[PDB]
């Protein structure tokens, strides 16, 4: 790629800041500004935090950033992000043989179907409560983050009474709310701080004998979480983990705010889940409506912008070559509405996945993480994030539960990250 | 030291976000929320960036922080800081014999008496020029930036021209306004990729020809620069270094539009400089009233707040006990104005430092450090930002050197870091 900005003499300029002022639309600048549409999927290389970068896109994208042969993600991602959200340590930096012992690990509490059973009658127990307290108006991303938090905390078998399980989710989705912007940046390190001391004496406790832990729970399998050599790893490791395990779960708070919003342009979607509801007796849990609804909102509405890996050997991409040790960025929200791979790729249209077998198998739906989960980086918690999103969708679809319609609870910046409904989506029930 | 601040099983606040929205205050607030006097020399123990720090004062916080046998630097200072503002791989975090090797090198350059005797006569030339140049309305603070700028770049050795000084200095002096705002802190982060890069091509150029450097010129020392064992340290680091002797001069226009809010609010010692400086044909150098007055301006007016060292060893200091490996904070701005060695500590009064033969020697007067230069940490620069900031209060002080006096020109922030009249003092010459 070729950018006519300054002389040939003149450096080409940084990107840092133009990201951070263009948020989710900042791969659609950086294309034109290489003389690209901002529906191509030709590589866009840049200058990024002061190193350069290839901007990556659709199956070719995919298959390069997850080729582990050719790809590291240790010190890819930079401390503004993993150091608030990931914490010291945590699987998202490893590689290799670290990697994999982890990441069976953790995928073994998160992305076995067994667990993610156990998981649905919490979220849907947590759910119809919250539509209850909601008689007195509250908002969706407030409220889910209680309920999603809630159900993680229980689902993963820690006993915490419920006042203290919304303090530290509300402070998990404070964290999310705050990190991504430079100005309410350090409010994320401040949650980060505060819930790693909870954490850590959490897992103090349970190595200890002070606090009750099933063997077979989450909270247990955390506490005995050992390196690649069956070694032990720190408390503040595991206390990092088992943060991975919930607080993503609470950031899907985000995505049901979407899914509101959502729901109020699309009524005639409202109203087909709702009828899917109601013929299970108003069931919230694996409607196939809702199902569609929730992974067509995760397709289209921005969460994810793109994730960073450093090339581990020479390479390259569609004619662009890739030096060893340089950045290689894949545009998440691109590659979901890249017009090459999707039908009508800038409709919000959830038929799209209705009757689709296996949506984890669609090679450019990537909103959490591509290829496998096990053998890369992908998430591992898509299934709960599935369940706790479509239950979500079939809640705020009844009639009864009242979404706002306010500018302010329908519209969001799309220059910000990360983003959402100003308001959370209004909601009341009545 | 007690914090009444909540219960006792809640553990006590993180104080990141109160240092923030604090500023220059945070010493101050710190001290009374454990029910101590503002004015008190007590050590204040706390939780900041999720580590336990104490916070010392005066003379015996002094002797604490700089002994080398209980306090390391490396991994002190915050990225947030030393990121943007030190570079990687800066001395201000090495210790042992790395940092020795390193620091002596460096005060060969800035703090040795004949290479301050160098440097006198491009400040003073480039002071004059810029009285011209402000017969278009300027401010000081910009002004100087780059007036500093090019006295340090000519004085080093570095062959740009004035237009290519003026860019780097401007550069550097963005640089310092905005690292340590949140909202702003990214930009700081993309002048030093772009400074780097400027700096690194040079090092570049000097060691393979394609630049000319006088072989006893400090381009060509940092071109030179070692290890401890005499290896030859890589371009970054020699690039990274040739900031940290030029960048912190162009720090001094700070001090220098603070001296011009003070010459207004003083204006006997205005007069004073002035006519000290008319009896020496007008010289801009080594005027003892505006020495003095530089002086009083580096104590009463904030700049470094306080900065962290861990420690290597448990120790105490005033019954307050240090544990190995948690944070030490000397209070800059507290000791530079404790009414327990200053002798009317709140009021500024250049008096204090008339007839002063080595200021440096004073331990409670620590604007740029304390204890010794070559032996520790101590800014080894004081030589060069005294005869800085001394000449451009002698040409602020003359009477056709017309210095603003709206309030955007005379008062400032005191909890924002760093910080400076809004206006950069405005200023026209007749
Ligand atoms: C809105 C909700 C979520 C979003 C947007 C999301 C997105 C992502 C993304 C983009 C990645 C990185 C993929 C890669 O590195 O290639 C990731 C990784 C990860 N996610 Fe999720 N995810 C969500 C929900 C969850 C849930 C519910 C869990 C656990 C129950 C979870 C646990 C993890 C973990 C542990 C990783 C690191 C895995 C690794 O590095 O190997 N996430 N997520
Ligand atoms: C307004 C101007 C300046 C201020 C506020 C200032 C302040 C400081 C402070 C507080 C330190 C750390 C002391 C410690 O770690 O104990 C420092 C270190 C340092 N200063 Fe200065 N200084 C200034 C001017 C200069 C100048 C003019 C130079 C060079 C010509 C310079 C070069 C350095 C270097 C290289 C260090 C690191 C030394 C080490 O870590 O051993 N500074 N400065
Ligand atoms: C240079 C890379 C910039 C883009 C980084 C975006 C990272 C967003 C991660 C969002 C993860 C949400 C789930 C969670 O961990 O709580
Ligand atoms: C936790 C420590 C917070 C305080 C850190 C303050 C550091 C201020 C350094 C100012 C140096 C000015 C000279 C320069 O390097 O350009």
Same mark, same amino acid.
């Given at each position: 790629?070729?950018?006519?900005?300054?002389?040939?003499?003149?450096? +080409?300029?940084?990107?840092?800041?133009?990201?951070?002022?263009?948020?989710?639309?900042?791969?659609?600048?950086?294309?034109?500004?290489?003389?690209?549409?901002?529906?191509?999927?030709?590589? /866009?290389?840049?200058?990024?935090?002061?190193? +350069?970068?290839?901007?990556?896109?659709?199956?070719?994208?995919?298959?390069?950033?997850?080729?582990?042969?050719?790809?590291? +993600?240790?010190?890819?991602?930079?401390?503004? !992000?993993?150091?608030?959200?990931?914490?010291?340590?945590?699987?998202?930096?490893?590689?290799?043989?670290?990697?994999?012992?982890?990441?069976?690990?953790?995928?073994?509490?998160?992305?076995?179907?067994? +667990?993610?059973?156990?998981?649905?009658?919490?979220?849907?127990?947590?759910?119809?409560?919250?539509?209850?307290?909601?008689?007195?108006?509250?908002?969706?991303?407030?409220?889910?983050?209680?309920?999603?938090?809630?159900?993680?905390?229980?689902?993963?078998?820690?006993?915490?009474?419920?006042?203290?399980?919304?303090?530290?989710?509300?402070?998990?989705?404070?964290?999310?709310?705050?990190?991504?912007?430079?100005?309410?940046?350090?409010?994320?390190?401040?949650?980060?701080?505060?819930?790693?001391?909870?954490?850590?004496?959490?897992?103090?406790?349970?190595?200890?004998?002070?606090?009750?832990?099933?063997?077979?729970?989450?909270?247990?399998?955390?506490?005995?979480?050992?390196?690649?050599?069956?070694?032990?790893?720190?408390?503040?490791?595991?206390? /990092?983990?088992?943060?991975?395990?919930?607080?993503?779960?609470?950031? /899907?708070?985000?995505?049901?705010?979407?899914?509101?919003?959502?729901?109020?342009?699309?009524?005639?979607?409202?109203?087909?889940?709702?009828?899917?509801?109601?013929?299970?007796?108003?069931?919230?849990?694996?409607?196939?409506?809702? #199902?569609?609804?929730?992974?067509? #909102?995760?397709?289209?509405?921005?969460?994810?912008?793109?994730?960073?890996?450093?090339?581990?050997?020479?390479?390259?991409?569609?004619?662009?070559?890739?030096?060893?040790?340089?950045?290689?960025?894949?545009?998440?929200?691109?590659?979901?509405?890249?017009?090459?791979?999707?039908?009508?790729?800038?409709?919000?249209?959830?038929?799209?996945?209705?009757?689709?077998?296996?949506?984890?198998?669609?090679?450019?739906? !990537?909103?959490?993480?591509? $290829?496998? /989960?096990?053998?890369?980086?992908?998430?591992?918690?898509?299934?709960?994030?599935?369940?706790?999103?479509?239950?979500?969708?079939?809640?705020?679809?009844?009639?009864?539960?009242?979404?706002?319609?306010?500018?302010?609870?329908?519209?969001?910046?799309?220059?910000?990250?990360?983003?959402?409904?100003?308001?959370?989506?209004? #909601?009341?029930? $009545?």
């Amino acid at each position: 790629s070729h950018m006519m900005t300054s002389t040939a003499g003149r450096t +080409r300029p940084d990107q840092v800041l133009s990201f951070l002022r263009s948020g989710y639309l900042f791969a659609s600048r950086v294309r034109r500004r290489t003389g690209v549409s901002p529906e191509s999927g030709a590589p /866009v290389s840049m200058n990024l935090l002061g190193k +350069r970068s290839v901007l990556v896109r659709g199956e070719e994208g995919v298959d390069l950033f997850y080729d582990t042969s050719r790809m590291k +993600r240790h010190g890819a991602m930079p401390l503004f !992000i993993r150091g608030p959200l990931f914490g010291s340590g945590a699987v998202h930096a490893l590689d290799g043989d670290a990697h994999a012992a982890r990441k069976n690990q953790m995928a073994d509490m998160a992305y076995e179907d067994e +667990r993610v059973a156990q998981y649905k009658p919490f979220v849907a127990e947590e759910l119809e409560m919250l539509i209850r307290e909601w008689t007195s108006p509250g908002n969706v991303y407030d409220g889910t983050a209680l309920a999603f938090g809630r159900a993680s905390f229980r689902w993963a078998g820690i006993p915490w009474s419920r006042q203290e399980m919304d303090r530290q989710a509300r402070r998990m989705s404070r964290l999310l709310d705050t990190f991504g912007r430079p100005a309410t940046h350090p409010i994320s390190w401040f949650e980060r701080f505060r819930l790693d001391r909870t954490f850590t004496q959490l897992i103090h406790g349970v190595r200890s004998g002070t606090v009750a832990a099933d063997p077979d729970s989450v909270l247990a399998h955390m506490a005995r979480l050992v390196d690649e050599n069956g070694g032990l790893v720190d408390e503040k490791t595991a206390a /990092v983990e088992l943060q991975n395990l919930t607080r993503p779960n609470v950031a /899907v708070a985000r995505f049901a705010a979407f899914a509101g919003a959502a729901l109020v342009e699309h009524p005639e979607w409202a109203a087909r889940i709702h009828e899917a509801s109601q013929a299970r007796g108003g069931s919230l849990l694996d409607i196939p409506e809702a #199902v569609a609804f929730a992974q067509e #909102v995760r397709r289209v509405y921005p969460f994810v912008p793109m994730l960073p890996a450093e090339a581990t050997a020479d390479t390259e991409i569609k004619g662009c070559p890739i030096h060893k040790g340089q950045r290689v960025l894949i545009d998440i929200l691109g590659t979901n509405n890249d017009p090459a791979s999707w039908e009508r790729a800038g409709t919000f249209d959830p038929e799209r996945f209705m009757g689709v077998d296996d949506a984890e198998a669609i090679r450019t739906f !990537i909103p959490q993480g591509g $290829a496998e /989960v096990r053998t890369g980086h992908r998430c591992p918690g898509e299934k709960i994030a599935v369940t706790s999103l479509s239950a979500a969708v079939v809640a705020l679809a009844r009639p009864n539960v009242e979404l706002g319609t306010d500018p302010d609870d329908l519209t969001f910046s799309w220059t910000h990250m990360l983003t959402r409904p100003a308001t959370g989506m209004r #909601v009341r029930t $009545a």
